[PDB]
Design a protein around this ligand. Structure first.
Ligand SMILES: O=C(COP(=O)(O)O)N(O)CCCOP(=O)(O)O
Ligand SMILES: O=C(COP(=O)(O)O)N(O)CCCOP(=O)(O)O
Ligand SMILES: [Zn+2]
Ligand SMILES: [Zn+2]
Lengths: 294, 297
């Protein structure tokens, strides 16, 4: 049952735990996420990038989530627009039924980012939808004092502080390093739920399965489980996870393709994929402490 | 927009053309099928096996179709339960929103098959839902349909359409040698029943699809489907609904295997399924024009 993204993140902010924000592009991904939340009794933060919406059609994105909500009525679910690049996009998501929208204007200067974000807040809050913004650059780092004013004047529901992460299986070209001292300053000055982008970990088991199936993850490096927990302690309440889901999913697809070359039954390809993806999500929920929160 | 399967097939039956019945198991397959019907201006017959419903959940199966119907309000769409094995199964489909159901009891004796079909018919017809039944066993080369038996069966059950066994079968391996269908037996059934007929296991395994699968490192172990000529012979023989599934799977997975081989560092699902959809869409588009359902909307 769709609920405001803030309704989920304010609880996580109070009690000091993190809720996983998992991306999806189709049915297989969506199904495995809900089943994971059901078996872990965990809140669900379902994300959809603009590239994913384009792929599915915003009508199918919301439509499929609504259907899933009906079969799992006891689970709190927030539908979040991931990385909206324009006011129009966020507005379309709001009209479509999204309960949470992100307006990514980190590339802009402070004033521009603030004005565009404020405009989005006015619109979304009017329709009862939560809003997410971003300061810093996913590649530089966030200015705690900027975050303080930014949050105060925009009245945004949650903020994504750049502390050293980035999307993809290749986050660190060296030793994984995040600015936790900066994260804590931001948390103290804003006192709102914080979001961590590019937070995939690339677990040993997930990497292993992918490489066994003839996949190439040479040099890949995500955020260690240690750091993910330090982030939550630091004030991170929303943890974006996508790469991990993809890798674990394709790992089984590649495997099936190798084992049996006469196999063309989609269900035989995506059944193991869903399972492998569900397990990654289940483990992540327990890691962040969102398990048994319902 | 959902329409009773009979609405689509009755037009095909009286105009003498065939409508493709395409199976789906998820969003990708469904989307490619709709875009095919849209680009070919063809009526859509969408069906799901009990295995597909198990995989998706009958709520999602129906839910996804209704969403697609909304983004394509000008295309007649029939939601069909493929190979329902029980009354309860057919009853669930009816309640879920299906517009057409098949009750497959062809493995039973005439009397049992008739008894079950009739019970399903009375229920489905009460909810404004069409029904399909089957006489004869879907096997390759009595197993073929008895024309007289079909006459009484249809006349007594009042079933909407009938799937007569004339030689086809499911899978990529239908013919071990020369393809052969009993078109004489088909025409007698059509004459005696005078209703829309359905052809099961009617995948052709086109050469471009076969080649594509083999290229991506796939293995078609002496697979052979129904030649394009046979399918056209079937339609001229009285066939109005043509079950297609294998062709879709193969064309789809072919593109999946390809991407896996081409780029081993690729793990973006959209990069795998975008080409897979396209390949599937083109298969459906060609089949629509072959069967002659193109431009009927
Ligand atoms: O934070 C992340 C990614 O985190 P991860 O790579 O560590 O999983 N995200 O918000 C995912 C953004 C989705 O992008 P796209 O669908 O266009 O490729
Ligand atoms: O006629 C056919 C298939 O014909 P084809 O194999 O020639 O494409 N069908 O009704 C499809 C039956 C679906 O079976 P499953 O349980 O594997 O989902
Ligand atoms: Zn991100
Ligand atoms: Zn069949």
């Amino acid at each position: 049952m769709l609920v405001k993204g803030n309704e989920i993140l304010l609880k996580a902010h109070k009690e000091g735990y993190g809720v996983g924000a998992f991306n999806f592009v189709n049915f297989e991904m969506l199904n495995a996420i809900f089943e994971a939340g059901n078996e872990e009794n965990s809140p669900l933060f379902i994300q959809a990038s603009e590239g994913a919406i384009k792929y599915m059609g915003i009508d199918m994105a919301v439509g499929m989530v609504k259907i899933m909500c009906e079969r799992y009525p006891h689970i709190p679910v927030a539908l979040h627009l991931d990385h909206g690049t324009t006011f129009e996009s966020c507005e379309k998501a709001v009209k479509a039924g999204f309960t949470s929208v992100m307006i990514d204007a980190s590339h802009h200067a402070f004033e521009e980012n603030l004005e565009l974000t404020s405009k989005v807040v006015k619109m979304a809050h009017n329709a009862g939808v939560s809003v997410e913004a971003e300061l810093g650059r996913l590649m530089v780092l966030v200015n705690p004092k900027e975050a303080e004013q930014f949050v105060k004047e925009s009245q945004v529901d949650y903020l994504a502080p750049a502390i050293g992460t980035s999307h993809g299986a290749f986050k660190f070209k060296g030793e994984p390093k995040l600015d936790f001292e900066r994260l804590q300053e931001v948390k103290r000055l804003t006192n709102i739920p914080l979001v961590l982008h590019g937070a995939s970990a690339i677990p040993d088991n997930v990497r292993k399965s992918y490489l066994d199936a003839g996949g190439d993850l040479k040099g890949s490096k995500g955020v260690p489980f240690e750091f993910l927990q330090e982030s939550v302690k630091g004030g991170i309440n929303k943890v974006n996870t996508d790469t991990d889901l993809r890798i674990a999913f394709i790992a089984e697809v590649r495997k099936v393709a190798n084992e049996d070359k006469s196999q063309f039954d989609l269900r035989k390809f995506f059944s193991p994929a869903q399972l492998a993806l569900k397990n990654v999500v289940k483990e992540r929920m327990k890691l962040l402490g969102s398990a048994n929160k319902i």
